[PDB]
Amino acid sequence: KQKVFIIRKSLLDELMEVQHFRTIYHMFIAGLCVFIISTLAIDFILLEFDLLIFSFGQLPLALVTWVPMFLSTLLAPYQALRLWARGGLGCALLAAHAVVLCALPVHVAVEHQLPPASRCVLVFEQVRFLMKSYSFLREAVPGILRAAPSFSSYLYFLFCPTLIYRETYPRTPYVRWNYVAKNFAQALGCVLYACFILGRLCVPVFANMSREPFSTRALVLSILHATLPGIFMLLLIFFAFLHCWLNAFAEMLRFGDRMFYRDWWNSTSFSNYYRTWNVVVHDWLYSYVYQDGLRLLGARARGVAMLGVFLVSAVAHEYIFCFVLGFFYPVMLILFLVIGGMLNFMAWNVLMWTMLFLGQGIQVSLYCQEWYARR
Amino acid sequence: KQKVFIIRKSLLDELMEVQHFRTIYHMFIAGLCVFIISTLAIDFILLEFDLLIFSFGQLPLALVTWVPMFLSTLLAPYQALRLWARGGLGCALLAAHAVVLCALPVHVAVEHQLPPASRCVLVFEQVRFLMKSYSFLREAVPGILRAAPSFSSYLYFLFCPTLIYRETYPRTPYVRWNYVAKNFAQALGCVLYACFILGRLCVPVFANMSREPFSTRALVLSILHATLPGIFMLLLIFFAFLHCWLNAFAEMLRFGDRMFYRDWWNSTSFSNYYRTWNVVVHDWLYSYVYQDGLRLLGARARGVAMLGVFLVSAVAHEYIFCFVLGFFYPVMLILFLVIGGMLNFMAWNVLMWTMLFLGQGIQVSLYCQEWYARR
Amino acid sequence: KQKVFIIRKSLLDELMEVQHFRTIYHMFIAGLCVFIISTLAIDFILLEFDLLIFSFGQLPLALVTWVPMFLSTLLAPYQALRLWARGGLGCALLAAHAVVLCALPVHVAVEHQLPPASRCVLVFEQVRFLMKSYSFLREAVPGILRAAPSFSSYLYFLFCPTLIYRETYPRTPYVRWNYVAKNFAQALGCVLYACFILGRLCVPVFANMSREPFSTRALVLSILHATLPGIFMLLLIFFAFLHCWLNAFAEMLRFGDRMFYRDWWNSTSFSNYYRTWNVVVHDWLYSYVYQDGLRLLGARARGVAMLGVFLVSAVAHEYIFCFVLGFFYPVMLILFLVIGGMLNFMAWNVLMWTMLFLGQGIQVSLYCQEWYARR
Amino acid sequence: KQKVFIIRKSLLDELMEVQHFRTIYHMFIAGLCVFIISTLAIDFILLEFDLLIFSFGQLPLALVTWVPMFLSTLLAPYQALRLWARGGLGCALLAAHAVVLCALPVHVAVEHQLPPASRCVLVFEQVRFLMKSYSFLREAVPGILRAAPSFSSYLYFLFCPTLIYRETYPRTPYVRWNYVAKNFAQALGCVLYACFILGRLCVPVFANMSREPFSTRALVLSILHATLPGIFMLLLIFFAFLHCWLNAFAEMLRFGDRMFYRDWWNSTSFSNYYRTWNVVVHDWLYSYVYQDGLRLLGARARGVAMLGVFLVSAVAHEYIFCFVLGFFYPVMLILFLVIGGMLNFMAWNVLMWTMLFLGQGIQVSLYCQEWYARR
């Protein structure tokens, strides 16, 4: 079974009309308004824009080095498949493409001493492009093996908010530019909220790790003190980059099928949590690793087939982190596995939320430790 | 217009069945589970039961001095009205009743050096009894002025969750003891949550006010650091003593009409906020001060009639606080007035939530300052 | 034969209407009025409230340590039987319940140096709860043994004036609050009468036991001098705690079947005296020891079966006394046995009344001796 | 209206069959049995027969000097009226009769130093004989005044339990000698009970009045200590000499109309108390002073007519007391008047019983004081 596309609307959006959720939304904006008034009134007697100006250090060079990678992932796979579907040298071309964005974004990352944010831009873009380039390839190839995909659909697909290539993509009548303006305003608001959290309740508690004799009193209490930044960081990532950002693009491109996330907050079974969190990357990983592993192995036993998807999911995130902050030690590999093992096999809903709270409380602390032990 | 009673169910209860709210409920229990695991794991290498054992110092003497006050407010008003409705000395008896719980709970509060919690018990009980005793009198008196209320209904009314005396009180078929057991379990859970907040994120930041040279750096930043304890304290008071506790008693006594609070979190207009927060005391204050002021004055201009209710509401809360922690300075009088003036006259919803957040952030800080400057 | 309940009225109550008994009742109130006028006129040139304030020393702590015992005996037996009737761990829970009010009321009695009155409160409450908790268990268990009792009926039963659990309890139309007010007024009057007796005709004769060379002149004459306090103490216990108090609760709870005592004062045979004095505890002891001993033993000879009930009745009262005044020596064990042996086997009515008069004359004297030899 | 005689039975006798009163009766016999066992067991290591042997000092001379007085009151009035009803010297004879028992029982009382008991015998006999001799005279005389009573009826009347002379006296079929034997057994039992009270709870507390500095501490407390002997003395006088003794004679003489006392213990109004206590002397006093005062004065105003009966009643009792113990000071004149004034003019039932209790408590104390201040 390969995914078939329908015209359902993003669950939170149709839910965002129910009044009590507009209240919760307003309560969180009040929370932002409290941080901005208090930080203003304190630092007046300027702001924590220290992070934004620092973190976005070489953002010009980041975007100027994004451009050629985008041009390469645009041209290379299409030309490769087009000549290859005329019966050549494509085998070398797509491999050269696989290299041009496997070395370039690492070279430009390390050799030019990039800050974290403008590093995370390029690393996300390289995984993104690898995923959807390969997706298009594995879709188009079986069509060629009889004893030409439309270019416009490909270029469209490269900006479409989904990683599955269908060259159908059932669309909406028109574009509510008021709605996309609101969505990007909220996305920027979310970035400012995350900036305030990392500037105020994350750094000041963790700046002073130079005064640590390997005691467990400034690690456990610090982890608990940092669990709330942790949960806000994760939940803001969710809202900003899965309901603000992807819905904004799903609007601009007239893209239907806006189910990027089903109710993950309701997930009783942990399988349901994997199923209904970030459904776009889940759909790619499911279609192109699980349902291809099952075919390649021909395995009745998914036991080895799955834990393949989990292993790829585990290395991808550690690669990203290890890349973004230049840290050789994986924590979220070991934490990913130990949380996997706990929630997978070992009102149940509470345990997931608890093991998610510390699931963040650990991530932030153990990183802000070595982000300063390296500085 | 005097209030008429109907068999509607408490809004949050019928809302508590909708699944996303069961999620939020579970998220908050996860929060509690994180505090208990972390406090256990820290203080093992015992608990903050320091507060519970301290705050409930003479709780025995508190309940044993509650008993006679309850016996007096039970007997005195009924006997007085009963002989007074036989044509006597009642005028002296009700005045003696008005004294016996105006002096006794102050005497036993000050002259025995009571802690805060077992002080707040008696002060709530004395205001409670004054309010509903007077309520019964002003209901039954006009019935007597023709040129006898059933006693069982009075003793019932004295325990009924509403402050209006109707001696009808439309009732429910039977008693779901599973539901009341759940409600009291949640109420105790709420007290443990509040204990953890006051023991962990309120006291440790505020213990060190002995090292203050009248700087505004350890007042403003401390107020913002204490805004979140503030909001949790208020919102736990709401859930514990308006949906856990009063619904539990509204169940045990087969009492219908469980509308103690309409959607206050939705209140756009501030008048609506006063209308739909703690509807029981609002209903008493409305019926017996506003609609009686309007009658006494005969005033077309409510301008003096209202600001009477607000003034009584303002002195009552300051009396409680000033009593409970033995503090002569009113803050929430001046704060009550300055917040009144701001939200009353000066998407709007956000401003209320913001001016509520600091509305708490101020109360806690300015008190935990003088609770230690006196100790 | 297990007891079946009927709607008969308490014999003394229906007798209290016959005019000559209203005379005797008035004669005894005259007696009280003589003590109050004379004590007032003497001690003016204040009262014997010395005993009431002393005896009720830590009455606050007594009621606050009563509360958890009541909560435990409410919850534990029901929850245990309920899960045990779902096919568990109940066997441990009821044993933990059997401990929580076997140690707690002894600990709080001895380790806090309680006075006699506020000791007798808790010791009565622990025996009371043990008796009716066990009663409920042994009633409900045989219902479960087929190859759920209503909770409301259990909590009701826990306050019902009878120790047999029936969950039927045939009830009266309504509640004569005038009658219950009268009953509690009489009960308080009885306590004041008993206070006056112990303060005037018991202590002043017995304070001077420091001047005793083991002579029989200040023991026998003192015993006779103290026989009348003795009879008034017993007969006031009868009227206060079997016709004032239990009828007041049998009224408040709409409980029918108010036969707590048949005409004991008429008892010719001593078996009839055991049968018709304090019929509630007699009914429990009969149903759950005699009629269960007969079943367990399968004994045609009740000779060992009875003297079981008598032995339990003998140890229970000595346990109470030994507990209440902290006296290791049993007298009313030996006196209970010697009076048993005399009236059981060895116009006849007179001998019982005589052997009751000294039956009291002994108890008081032999106690007020060692209550001061220990002080 | 002069009294007319009917065949009603003594109220307590027909009441003595109702079972609860047989219980009270047995309770009082138990009380006697306790005094006899305890006095025996004490004085063994003989009895208080000291009083009986002392008080009945010259009882032989008392009876031998009773005889001639009886012979005189028998013969003199009959012979006087018989000759006087033959048309003489009768006017001198009845006057000589009035002297022969007005001087003789005083002479033999004082000049021979008689003890109290054997004095009270003769003083009762002289008032008794005066009353019924005069009664017969005032009955028979109006029959003679037309322009002979049967002797046997007179001699009978002189022993009849009533003071009104009717020479009809409606009689009963026969004589239940079992019943009269029981009555005299009870009468002797009552004398033994009174002896025990005066020997044990009256004298030992009052022997030590030689050690009094005119303090009010050994007068008020002693009066209260002696109120219970007081009430038993009065109530035993009632039972012994109005239900044991007069009913025994009302049996032996086949006399109907045994209403010597209606329910005095029920008397709400004090007029009812005078009406229904000792109805025999009341009937004489009513018939021969009140209904003759009203005739002599012809007074519409009974105000002076009554207070005549009260004055005669007041002097008669003080004469008796003053005679019996040789005490010149009247207390029960002043107490009679002060109790008269209080209960006559100034659930009401209680006050009478209270003012009776002290009404005795005073009498005994104030006498046992001067019975020893004279000895």
Ligand SMILES: CC(C)c1cccc(C(C)C)c1NC(=O)NCC1(c2ccc(N(C)C)cc2)CCCC1
């Ligand atoms: C949030 C994470 C623990 C998680 C839980 C369950 C399932 C998944 C995948 C297989 C869909 C993920 N990982 C993810 O979605 N990674 C991609 C993104 C991501 C989210 C959070 C994090 N952090 C934990 C910082 C990193 C990447 C989504 C939004 C931005 C990219």
Ligand SMILES: CC(C)c1cccc(C(C)C)c1NC(=O)NCC1(c2ccc(N(C)C)cc2)CCCC1
């Ligand atoms: C919460 C408060 C600012 C407020 C806002 C709007 C309207 C009212 C009244 C007129 C109903 C109140 N005050 C109140 O309800 N006082 C009584 C109680 C109360 C609530 C909070 C506080 N604190 C602010 C600690 C004190 C009392 C309700 C729950 C317990 C008693």
Ligand SMILES: CC(C)c1cccc(C(C)C)c1NC(=O)NCC1(c2ccc(N(C)C)cc2)CCCC1
């Ligand atoms: C009064 C006692 C000697 C007695 C005689 C005959 C039968 C019984 C029982 C088996 C019903 C008792 N004991 C009793 O009833 N104990 C319980 C109570 C009791 C009564 C008197 C005493 N005292 C002798 C002080 C102690 C307990 C009843 C009222 C208060 C509790």
Ligand SMILES: CC(C)c1cccc(C(C)C)c1NC(=O)NCC1(c2ccc(N(C)C)cc2)CCCC1
């Ligand atoms: C008992 C007395 C206070 C009293 C109250 C009310 C009415 C009367 C009369 C008018 C019938 C009397 N007095 C009386 O009855 N005197 C005669 C007797 C009497 C009774 C008691 C006393 N004492 C007070 C010792 C003296 C005489 C009756 C039984 C023996 C003679």
Ligand SMILES: CC(C)CCC[C@@H](C)[C@H]1CC[C@H]2[C@@H]3CC=C4C[C@@H](O)CC[C@]4(C)[C@H]3CC[C@]12C
């Ligand atoms: C606009 C700026 C201030 C960011 C606002 C973020 C808020 C409005 C968004 C981001 C994540 C969202 C939450 C994530 C999921 C849940 C759990 C659900 O059971 C209740 C709604 C709730 C709690 C959502 C409410 C709206 C939400 C809180």
Ligand SMILES: CC(C)CCC[C@@H](C)[C@H]1CC[C@H]2[C@@H]3CC=C4C[C@@H](O)CC[C@]4(C)[C@H]3CC[C@]12C
């Ligand atoms: C709070 C501080 C650290 C600001 C954080 C800035 C970074 C972490 C945030 C802000 C804007 C975000 C980016 C905006 C949108 C995109 C395009 C998408 O195709 C890849 C992810 C990427 C590149 C996001 C990654 C995370 C991001 C770069």
Ligand SMILES: CC(C)CCC[C@@H](C)[C@H]1CC[C@H]2[C@@H]3CC=C4C[C@@H](O)CC[C@]4(C)[C@H]3CC[C@]12C
């Ligand atoms: C049981 C213990 C842990 C206390 C739990 C308190 C939680 C479950 C209760 C107390 C107060 C309640 C909240 C108060 C009002 C709102 C605003 C509304 O727009 C969304 C629901 C929400 C957010 C409620 C959800 C449930 C709630 C959070």
Ligand SMILES: CC(C)CCC[C@@H](C)[C@H]1CC[C@H]2[C@@H]3CC=C4C[C@@H](O)CC[C@]4(C)[C@H]3CC[C@]12C
């Ligand atoms: C967190 C720490 C300080 C514990 C706080 C304990 C106090 C503040 C809480 C816990 C239980 C609460 C009480 C329980 C219920 C009642 C009965 C009601 O008729 C008056 C209010 C009153 C008396 C509550 C007042 C507030 C209260 C006393």
Ligand SMILES: CC(C)CCC[C@@H](C)[C@H]1CC[C@H]2[C@@H]3CC=C4C[C@@H](O)CC[C@]4(C)[C@H]3CC[C@]12C
């Ligand atoms: C109200 C205060 C003063 C206490 C009064 C106690 C009196 C009124 C009560 C308590 C015990 C009762 C007594 C106990 C039993 C008997 C024996 C019976 O054969 C006659 C009634 C009699 C004598 C009762 C009469 C009423 C009584 C005496």
Ligand SMILES: CC(C)CCC[C@@H](C)[C@H]1CC[C@H]2[C@@H]3CC=C4C[C@@H](O)CC[C@]4(C)[C@H]3CC[C@]12C
């Ligand atoms: C005369 C002086 C000593 C006063 C005596 C006070 C004591 C002995 C009396 C007064 C009130 C009585 C208590 C009131 C009612 C109850 C509740 C019942 O479920 C158990 C017995 C118990 C607890 C009684 C026991 C005896 C008691 C405690």
Ligand SMILES: CC(C)CCC[C@@H](C)[C@H]1CC[C@H]2[C@@H]3CC=C4C[C@@H](O)CC[C@]4(C)[C@H]3CC[C@]12C
């Ligand atoms: C035979 C010896 C022991 C003397 C016995 C005296 C007793 C049995 C007699 C003498 C006086 C009598 C009492 C006097 C009047 C009353 C008041 C009445 O409302 C109840 C009966 C009662 C209480 C009588 C009961 C029997 C009585 C007590």
Ligand SMILES: CC(C)CCC[C@@H](C)[C@H]1CC[C@H]2[C@@H]3CC=C4C[C@@H](O)CC[C@]4(C)[C@H]3CC[C@]12C
């Ligand atoms: C307790 C001690 C003092 C014994 C008292 C003995 C005296 C007071 C008692 C015992 C027997 C009684 C007497 C027996 C019967 C009679 C005959 C009657 O026609 C006159 C009264 C009279 C004479 C009684 C008067 C009181 C009396 C004399």
Ligand SMILES: CCCCCCCC/C=C\CCCCCCCC(=O)O
């Ligand atoms: C597993 C690692 C996470 C990789 C993140 C993938 C994000 C989802 C992928 C594609 C949808 C994004 C489409 C809209 C972004 C266009 C912005 C741009 O090109 O600058």
Ligand SMILES: CCCCCCCC/C=C\CCCCCCCC(=O)O
């Ligand atoms: C304005 C000051 C706030 C006063 C608080 C009043 C609370 C609401 C009043 C009555 C409803 C309470 C009924 C249930 C409580 C019974 C508990 C008890 O009696 O101990």
Ligand SMILES: CCCCCCCC/C=C\CCCCCCCC(=O)O
């Ligand atoms: C044998 C030892 C005597 C034990 C005494 C037992 C008393 C009779 C038992 C139960 C009936 C009492 C019911 C009314 C009391 C409720 C008062 C309360 O709970 O405080």
Ligand SMILES: CCCCCCCC/C=C\CCCCCCCC(=O)O
């Ligand atoms: C007012 C002073 C009291 C006087 C007492 C009078 C007693 C009642 C009078 C007469 C009835 C007595 C009849 C039986 C007694 C005969 C005994 C005898 O003669 O020895």
